[PDB]
Write a protein that binds this ligand. Structure first.
Ligand code: CLA
Ligand code: CLA
Ligand code: CLA
Ligand code: CLA
Ligand code: CLA
Ligand code: CLA
Ligand code: CLA
Ligand SMILES: CC(=O)O[C@H]1CC(C)(C)C(=C=C/C(C)=C/C=C/C(C)=C/C=C/C=C(C)/C=C/C=C(\C)C(=O)C[C@@]23O[C@]2(C)C[C@@H](O)CC3(C)C)[C@](C)(O)C1
Ligand SMILES: CC(=O)O[C@H]1CC(C)(C)C(=C=C/C(C)=C/C=C/C(C)=C/C=C/C=C(C)/C=C/C=C(\C)C(=O)C[C@@]23O[C@]2(C)C[C@@H](O)CC3(C)C)[C@](C)(O)C1
Ligand SMILES: CC1=C(C#C/C(C)=C/C=C/C(C)=C/C=C/C=C(C)/C=C/C=C(C)/C=C/[C@@]23O[C@]2(C)C[C@@H](O)CC3(C)C)C(C)(C)C[C@H](O)C1
Ligand SMILES: CC1=C(/C=C/C(C)=C/C=C/C(C)=C/C=C/C=C(C)/C=C/C=C(C)/C=C/C2=C(C)CCCC2(C)C)C(C)(C)CCC1
Lengths: 154, 198, 143, 142, 33, 158
């Protein structure tokens, strides 16, 4: 079926969803899951590194994640949005392709993959889940205390 | 405009009531678009009537709207209905506008049958599942009750547009509406700009 | 779990079907670039390539030119971009003359008429892109 | 050249030829539409319909351009340039390449008003209103 | 005089560039049928 | 003279096909440029009369245009020379766009390529071009021999 099932929880699906949903709906769910995990991993790494190492912008932007983005200039935000939009139109074209594999920009249906490929895909998925929880935790902590992750840990 | 629901009414002498004949500007597509626009206007006017009543009466959520900027529902509830929108922080107004934007985009896109002008029913939004009737209160009824209930939706929507246009002018054209002139509550600007000043 | 296989199931062609060469991202980006996009006429291909290159060609001359610390820095940069574009389209024309000597097909980049249309589009697009970049850099205070 | 929207034999000092008639009609329709918008803008700005703002309150249609060149007219220039780039894609491909399309038809018919029983009426109305506005603007701007 | 400005670029950039272009095209001309 | 054309063609068989050479297309295009140039020198004459062209003994500086300013050389470039050169650069850029760009509209330059021919000679513009180019060569002849300049000759003759 898919790769997400793991030892600690098994096939975690209390509330249905998987059944009574179209294959297109399942592909959309897995694409959204992988996108969330990847973006959350990027956010976690960015917050962790930018807490204690932010050389850009003359080192003046705050370590608070929720205020550093406010202090970033408008042109930088526009360029980041343009880059993300370009990545997303590539994702849309990949969706329109007839051999789409939710989340697989690499292809990977055209190579002799084995169980190690599924294991590594599960590694990506579980790290993405952990980052999904962690990034929202980081943002909530920044809103509450005003400190970033590592500053809070101090 | 003869198959549409609002065609027959006791007050309109059972007539389609198109004096300017605007139904003939195009095919069935433009009339479907006009009906969808009418339904959306009536719905937003209904919500506007409820919010305006809740504002001119003392009914507000308790707490701080924007703890960072010190803007509070109490401050919004004592500057008249419309200057409250100006008093909302810009980024909060942008998060309301963006959510309405995404909802509108979903309405235009996600209909399985197709566009309301090209196969969908005008005013149908339930392809966004549980967007409407989240409680699901309407599940009990059948189609025949829903027909009369949609007729009442159209009529009440027209009346709500009339009411909100009343309150929006009485602000702007002094004493626009007799009996809506005292303004014990109707104060300030009548039509706000989006994002305050832009 | 092999990830590098023969190119088009041909072990004896001098290529490999690596993730870089053959992945869906590479295929999408390359096939959707103007030079490979489907349905675009040679004029449209040349036009898109022209504006894309002429927009960025001004910047090096403007910032790092001899007259960077001069009031006419941007004008000199635009003239330098125009000269480089003139050289580029001269190169394109002589390349077409040398390669597509005899041809009567047209509507194809590998034909004389198609390459001439592509070069014309490139010239117009590059001049327009350099001019637009000049306007943007003059009105940089907007951003 | 003998059959077109609002077509008569009004061609003194003639220039229109089977090759350039489509380009010329596109130019006519574009100039006409820009003229209707220019006439509406000038008459509104003169009458008193004005944006909310101190920067706009003291401006008039003659002096508005110089004051608004920095930000507002520059944003308008950006938007117009984008739309005109798409239109220029279509026109360059049509004239200097291959294409089956009419003049002035950019596909801006989402309301499907052209499905009406009277769509030649709309095309003609666009043409004459553009011309009448293009001459009224010639009067008022000069 | 102004002859240096008029002639040095003309004879050292435009003329040699055209000469290189002409020579390249001529050497790439194929046999006649 | 057709014999001389055949002698040329024969000698230079390549330049011949694109219209570069003693060709009617080449004669027409120059003639157009020569008529525009008569108009141009008249425009500069009236502009200099009405002191239109930033002008005088003002000269460029190395700090504004660098080595192209030629400051320190014997040549003394003027701001009028600079602005007229800018105008000519704009003319050249528009011309280059019209030539190497699409034959958007009007007339080609390279004999329309496509193996077209040269139409041997309103269609009186070639006669006007003969007039304009003979006038121009006469003007250089007097400017070289009599040494009486160009704008001065135009003004006194007109
Ligand atoms: C072979 C001799 C020779 C050489 C090496 C040079 C060198 C030079 N001349 Mg030239 N010049 C020459 C003869 C020569 N000249 C002659 C006889 C005349 C006619 C009166 C001129 C008139 C002249 C002027 C008016 C100017 C120069 C200038 C210059 C300088 C810049 C180059 C330029 O574009 O000028 C080339 C300009 C010409 C008019 C050239 C005319 C044709 C010559 C004679 C061709 C020589 C070809 C050679 C014998 C064979 C080439 C073989 C091949 C394999 C390379 C440079 C120092 C400029 C200067 O002073 O800059 C500071 C400048 O303004 N020259
Ligand atoms: C929003 C991100 C997201 C999405 C789209 C999915 C999607 C999927 N997961 Mg899930 N998953 C996620 C996050 C997500 N997961 C996280 C963070 C974890 C760690 C606990 C897991 C753990 C997990 C396991 C262990 C397994 C799956 C599996 C699946 C698949 C089947 C279940 C399904 O249809 O869920 C649909 C999900 C949604 C529609 C998302 C919204 C759900 C509700 C409406 C709201 C959010 C819940 C709750 C309020 C959380 C926020 C509160 C607080 C923490 C802030 C599907 C591809 C199974 C699989 O792949 O089997 C082959 C599987 O074995 N997931
Ligand atoms: C969700 C993704 C995300 C977002 C929204 C932001 C947002 C921000 N980061 Mg970044 N950042 C990210 C991921 C992200 N980061 C990652 C993955 C890293 C680790 C390489 C960093 C490392 C980083 C540093 C070291 C700094 C920022 C800083 C910033 C600010 C703007 C400059 C910038 O983006 O440089 C990002 C530069 C990169 C090389 C990221 C590459 C992203 C991959 C290739 C995709 C802004 C607060 C600056 C700041 O104000 O810090 C307080 C700053 O100095 N970020
Ligand atoms: C389009 C109509 C509209 C608009 C533009 C506004 C605008 C506003 N309302 Mg809202 N309001 C509306 C309809 C509207 N309301 C309706 C239909 C209701 C009845 C539920 C309310 C009930 C309401 C209250 C109780 C309060 C506001 C407040 C406000 C202000 C601050 C934002 C906020 O917290 O909103 C909150 C708005 C909502 C939660 C409702 C959004 C509308 C959707 C369609 C209904 C969702 C219902 C669902 C069960 C939850 C702002 C001026 C606050 C204020 O400062 O008042 C002075 C405030 O305390 N509104
Ligand atoms: C290779 C080393 C090098 C470098 C870095 C430079 C750099 C420079 N020289 Mg040059 N110079 C060099 C060698 C070099 N020079 C040599 C060998 C000589 C002796 C002949 C000179 C002689 C010389 C002179 C006489 C002058 C310069 C000047 C300059 C400046 C501007 C030149 C210009 O307009 O470039 C234009 C460059 C471009 C239009 C394009 C450059 C390449 C682009 C940026 C590459 C991008 C690649 C991209 C990442 C690919 C992937 C993209 C994809 C992912 C989408 C600049 C500081 C001028 C100046 O004012 O100096 C301060 C000047 O007057 N140089
Ligand atoms: C990294 C690769 C790459 C790059 C560099 C580009 C670059 C470009 N693409 Mg894109 N494109 C790409 C990948 C890429 N694309 C991919 C992968 C796809 C697949 C989705 C596309 C699909 C695509 C399409 C379908 C189109 C483009 C187009 C464009 C161009 C946008 C021009 C425009 O309208 O700007 C916006 C306009 C402006 C910034 C101008 C603003 C106005 C200025 C300020 C005023 C100038 C005034 C001046 C004085 C002139 C006066 C004129 C008159 C009054 C006389 C640009 C050159 C468009 C195009 O036109 O291409 C031919 C287009 O239609 N691309
Ligand atoms: C006689 C031949 C010739 C001529 C007339 C020029 C003329 C020029 N070159 Mg030079 N250039 C030449 C040969 C020549 N180049 C050669 C052979 C090289 C390669 C070694 C270069 C490499 C070069 C560079 C790298 C640069 C120039 C630049 C310039 C400009 C200098 C502007 C200033 O004020 O200083 C000017 C247009 C500068 C410029 O702005 O160019 C656009 C510049 O950056 N040139
Ligand atoms: C198909 C479809 O339609 O799908 C969707 C699309 C659509 C429409 C979008 C939908 C939605 C709604 C969504 C998902 C909306 C999400 C909104 C989101 C995510 C909104 C974040 C706000 C965060 C803010 C304002 C942070 C402030 C932060 C502040 C004020 C700070 O700077 C904090 C701080 O100052 C303190 C307090 C103390 C200081 O010492 C330190 C600093 C300065 C740092 C729907 C309805 O679900 C449907
Ligand atoms: C002399 C004179 O009169 O001068 C003035 C004074 C005066 C009269 C004040 C004026 C005014 C204003 C007017 C006329 C204003 C009228 C406003 C109007 C008519 C406002 C309707 C809102 C309806 C809503 C919000 C409905 C929501 C409904 C909902 C969400 C539901 O009940 C859901 C539902 O699931 C339930 C719960 C039960 C189900 O069984 C049915 C459904 C599924 C639907 C004028 C015109 O200016 C004239
Ligand atoms: C004697 C003889 C023969 C002969 C002959 C004869 C009589 C030949 C005569 C030839 C003749 C009389 C040839 C003139 C050309 C003039 C031209 C091209 C000028 C263009 C000039 C132009 C286009 C200038 C333009 C501008 O500069 C202007 C003016 C203003 C500036 O703002 C810039 C611009 C660019 C706009 C045979 C028959 C051949 C056989 C054998 O050989 C023997
Ligand atoms: C992919 C990718 C990348 C890259 C990128 C790039 C490569 C970019 C580029 C960009 C660019 C480079 C852009 C450009 C743009 C342009 C424009 C925007 C233009 C415009 C133009 C116009 C508009 C024109 C006009 C005209 C004409 C056409 C002609 C005549 C004149 C005129 C002016 C009218 C990176 C590395 C990041 C990484 C990730 C991925």
């Amino acid at each position: 079926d898919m790769v997400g099932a793991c030892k600690p929880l098994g096939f975690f699906d209390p509330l249905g969803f998987s059944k009574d949903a179209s294959p297109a709906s399942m592909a959309k769910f897995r694409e959204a899951e992988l996108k969330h995990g990847r973006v959350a991993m990027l956010a976690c790494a960015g917050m962790i590194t930018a807490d204690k190492f932010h050389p850009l912008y003359d080192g003046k932007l705050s370590s608070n994640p929720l205020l550093a983005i406010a202090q970033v200039p408008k042109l930088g935000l526009l360029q980041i949005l343009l880059f993300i939009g370009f990545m997303e139109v590539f994702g849309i074209l990949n969706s329109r392709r007839p051999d789409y594999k939710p989340g697989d920009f690499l292809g990977s249906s055209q190579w002799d993959t084995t169980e190690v490929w599924d294991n590594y895909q599960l590694r990506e998925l579980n790290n993405g889940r952990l980052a999904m929880f962690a990034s929202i935790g980081m943002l909530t902590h920044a809103y509450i205390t005003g400190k970033g992750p590592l500053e809070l840990l101090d | 405009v003869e198959t549409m629901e609002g065609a027959a009414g006791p007050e309109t002498a059972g007539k389609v009531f198109d004096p300017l004949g605007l139904a003939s500007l195009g095919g069935e597509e433009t009339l479907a678009f006009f009906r969808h626009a009418e339904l959306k206007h009536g719905r937003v006017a209904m919500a506007a009537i409820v919010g305006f009543q809740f504002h001119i009466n003392h009914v507000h959520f308790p707490g701080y709207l924007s703890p960072s900027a010190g803007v509070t529902f109490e401050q919004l509830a004592g500057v008249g209905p419309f200057e409250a929108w100006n008093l909302i922080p810009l980024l909060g107004k942008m998060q309301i506008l963006f959510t309405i934007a995404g909802l509108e985009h979903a309405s235009e896109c996600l209909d399985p049958a197709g566009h309301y002008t090209k196969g969908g029913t005008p005013g149908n939004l339930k392809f966004l599942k549980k967007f409407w009737d989240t409680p699901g209160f309407t599940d009990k009824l059948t189609e025949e009750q829903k027909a009369t209930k949609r007729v009442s939706e159209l009529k009440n929507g027209r009346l709500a547009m009339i009411g909100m246009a009343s309150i929006i002018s009485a602000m702007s054209i002094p004493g626009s509406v007799p009996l809506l002139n005292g303004a014990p509550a109707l104060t300030g600007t009548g039509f706000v700009l989006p994002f305050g000043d832009f | 779990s092999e990830f590098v296989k023969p190119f088009n199931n041909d072990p004896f062609v001098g290529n490999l079907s690596t993730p870089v060469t053959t992945s869906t991202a590479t295929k999408l980006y390359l096939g959707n670039l103007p030079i490979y996009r489907k349905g675009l006429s040679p004029l449209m291909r040349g036009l898109e390539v022209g504006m894309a290159h002429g927009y960025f060609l001004i910047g090096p001359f403007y910032i790092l030119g001899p007259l960077r610390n001069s009031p006419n820095a941007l004008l000199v940069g635009l003239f330098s971009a125009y000269g480089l574009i003139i050289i580029l389209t001269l190169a394109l024309t002589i390349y077409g003359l040398a390669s597509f000597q005899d041809n009567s097909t047209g509507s194809n980049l590998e034909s004389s008429k198609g390459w001439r249309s592509f070069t014309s589009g490139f010239t117009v697009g590059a001049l327009g892109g350099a001019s637009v970049a000049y306007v943007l850099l003059n009105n940089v205070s907007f951003f | 050249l003998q059959g077109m929207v609002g077509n008569v034999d009004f061609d003194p000092l003639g220039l229109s030829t089977p090759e350039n008639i489509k380009w010329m009609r596109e130019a006519e329709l574009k100039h006409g539409r820009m003229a209707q918008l220019a006439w509406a803008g000038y008459v509104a700005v003169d009458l008193g319909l004005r944006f909310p703002g101190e920067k706009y309150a003291g401006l008039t249609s003659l002096s508005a351009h110089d004051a608004t060149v920095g930000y507002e007219l520059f944003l308008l220039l950006l938007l117009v340039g984008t739309f005109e780039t798409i239109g220029g894609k279509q026109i360059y491909d049509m004239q200097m390449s291959g294409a089956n399309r009419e003049a002035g038809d950019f596909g801006f018919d989402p309301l499907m008003l052209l499905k009406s029983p009277n769509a030649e009426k709309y095309k003609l109305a666009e043409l004459t209103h553009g011309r009448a506005a293009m001459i009224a603007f010639s009067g008022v701007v000069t | 005089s102004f002859l240096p400005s008029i002639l040095t670029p003309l004879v050292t950039l435009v003329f040699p560039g055209l000469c290189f272009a002409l020579f390249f095209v001529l050497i790439e001309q194929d046999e006649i049928a | 003279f057709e014999a001389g054309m055949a002698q040329y063609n024969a000698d230079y068989p390549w330049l011949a096909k694109y219209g570069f050479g003693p060709s009617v297309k080449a004669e027409r295009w120059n003639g157009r440029h020569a008529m525009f140039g008569w108009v141009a020198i008249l425009a500069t004459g009236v502009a200099k009369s009405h002191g239109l062209l930033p002008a005088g003994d003002l000269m460029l500086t190395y700090q504004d245009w660098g080595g192209l300013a030629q400051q320190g050389f014997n040549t003394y470039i003027s701001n009028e020379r600079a602005v007229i050169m800018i105008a000519h650069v704009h003319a050249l850029a528009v011309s280059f766009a019209a030539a190497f760009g699409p034959q958007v509209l009007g007339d080609s330059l390279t004999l329309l390529d496509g193996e077209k021919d040269e139409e041997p000679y309103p269609a009186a513009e070639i006669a006007n071009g003969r007039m304009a180019m003979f006038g121009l060569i006469s003007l250089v002849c007097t400017s070289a021999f009599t040494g009486m300049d160009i704008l001065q000759i135009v003004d006194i003759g007109t």
